[PDB]
């Protein structure tokens, strides 16, 4: 086999600031009747197919933007990326094709951008669900960088069923937003009246709180 | 156009077999070698084996992985590629992507398929629930709960609203998955204007449209 490694597994970097990263094979992916390295990089944007980028090492392939630039040879390869953009959030992938075909593992490439707070919105059980015997209570802590952040929810004033979820990065505007889930029975929600999504976050030594009361409803 | 459209992806159990299709066109499909590459969900891209073109006689070749369970094939009448899969396991769930690949100069795979999703577990299909998520500008929601194999698509307004969207990856509780989709609009659009969330789920052919109402 040729073994295909990247480096480095995953950072982040500014808009406007250069990207490096790198591919190294365990053979040399240079043919020498086609003087040409067998070394493709591929672009996979969050949820999307993977995306031809530079083929043969350095050949840039039509549509892809000047700022990325494949360059080396033998067993070494870099992918570099000028002038970053939001929009370059992605894991790149480099393959070789000497010998059939293997990808490296991947650099995740994320981008940093300056604090944000989240934006937070609660809601409650729907009377279709309620019907069925039970509650969920949902609350979003929408476009916050950077990631890190702490959850917490308070029924009837105490801390308490979760299912925490945060999305990728955004391609726009480089933040991240994320969903917690708490679900109980009808008849335990039914006990209480005040539900209570608590949000801290750097961005502010207050947690953001968002409540609603049952009997409100 | 180039298009590249797999299917056939969904739930089967251990041990059983599958049979993905990718169909092909807006190029000469016979001049073009054509590869499979699988993707276990949030894992790297792995290359499956591909069949070769017609001036070298369609012949194919497989990773050391899967070589002797999967076989490849193709229909060169209708530009259809076919993966066989056989005694299928756990570490056979992923996306699976046909590629176009070699045409005896260029070294790069040009096209990628949107991916088919296999599932390789003993759980049975469950169809999903779906809740509704009502309160400058505001937030609204949908709730996508309970529901197996992946996956489920979340548009708004049948794709219309698409920015300001949040739609949260499934998470797997008690063998059941989870997922909630988020759309923000400006608070005069609402209720004035209806928002409502279209939600698919592929295994038991679930078409819901959930309007948000105030
Ligand atoms: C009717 C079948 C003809 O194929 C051959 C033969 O053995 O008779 C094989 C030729 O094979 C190559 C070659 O230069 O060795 C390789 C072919 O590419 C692949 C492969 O199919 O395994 C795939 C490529 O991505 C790359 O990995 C290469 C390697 O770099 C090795 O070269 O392998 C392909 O490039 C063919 C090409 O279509 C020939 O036109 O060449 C070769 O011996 C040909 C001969 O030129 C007559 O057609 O016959
Ligand atoms: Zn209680
Ligand atoms: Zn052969």
């Known amino acids: 086999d040729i073994v295909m490694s990247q480096s480095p597994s995953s950072l982040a970097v500014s808009a406007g600031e250069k990207v490096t990263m790198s591919c190294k094979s365990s053979?040399?992916?240079?043919?020498?009747?086609?003087?040409?390295?067998?070394l493709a990089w591929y672009q996979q944007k969050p949820g999307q197919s993977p995306k031809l980028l530079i083929y043969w090492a350095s050949t840039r392939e039509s549509g892809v933007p000047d700022r990325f630039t494949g360059s080396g040879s033998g067993t070494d390869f870099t992918l570099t990326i000028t002038s970053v953009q939001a929009e370059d959030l992605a894991v790149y992938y480099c393959?070789?094709?000497?010998?059939?075909?293997?990808f490296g593992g991947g650099t995740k490439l994320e981008i940093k951008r300056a604090d944000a707070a989240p934006t937070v919105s609660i809601f409650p059980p729907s009377s279709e669900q309620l019907t069925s015997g039970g509650a969920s209570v949902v609350c979003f802590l929408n476009n916050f960088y950077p990631k890190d952040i702490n959850v917490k929810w308070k029924i009837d004033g105490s801390e308490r069923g979760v299912l925490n979820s945060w999305t990728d990065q955004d391609s726009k505007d480089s933040t991240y937003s994320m969903s917690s889930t708490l679900t109980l029975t009808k008849d335990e929600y039914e006990r209480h009246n005040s539900y209570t999504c608590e949000a801290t976050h750097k961005t502010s030594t207050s947690p953001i709180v968002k409540s609603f009361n049952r009997n409100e409803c | 156009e180039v298009k590249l459209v797999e299917s056939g992806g969904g739930l089967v159990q251990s041990g059983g077999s599958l049979r993905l299709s990718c169909a092909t066109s807006?190029?000469?499909?016979?001049?073009?070698?054509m590869s499979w590459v699988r993707q276990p969900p949030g894992k790297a891209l792995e290359w499956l084996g591909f069949i070769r073109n017609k001036a070298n006689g369609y012949t194919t070749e497989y990773s050391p992985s899967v070589k002797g369970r999967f076989t490849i094939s193709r229909d060169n009448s209708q530009s259809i590629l076919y993966l066989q899969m056989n005694t299928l396991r756990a570490e056979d769930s992923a996306t699976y992507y046909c590629?176009?690949?070699?045409?005896?100069?260029?070294?790069?795979?040009?096209?990628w398929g949107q991916g088919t999703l296999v599932t390789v577990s003993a759980a049975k299909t469950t169809p999903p629930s779906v809740y509704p998520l009502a309160p400058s500008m505001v937030t609204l929601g949908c709730l996508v709960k309970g529901y197996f194999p992946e996956p489920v698509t979340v548009t708004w307004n049948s794709g219309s609203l698409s920015s300001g969207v949040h739609t949260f990856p499934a998470v797997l509780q008690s063998d059941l998955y989870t997922l909630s989709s988020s759309v923000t609009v400006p608070s005069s659009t609402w209720p004035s204007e209806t928002v409502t969330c279209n939600v698919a789920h592929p295994a038991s052919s679930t078409k819901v449209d959930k309007k948000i109402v105030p």
């Open positions: 590629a176009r690949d070699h045409d005896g100069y260029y070294e790069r795979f040009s096209y």
């Open positions: 393959k070789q094709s000497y010998n059939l075909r293997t």
């Open positions: 807006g190029f000469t499909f016979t001049d073009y070698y």
């Open positions: 053979q040399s992916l240079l043919n020498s009747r086609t003087r040409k390295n067998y």
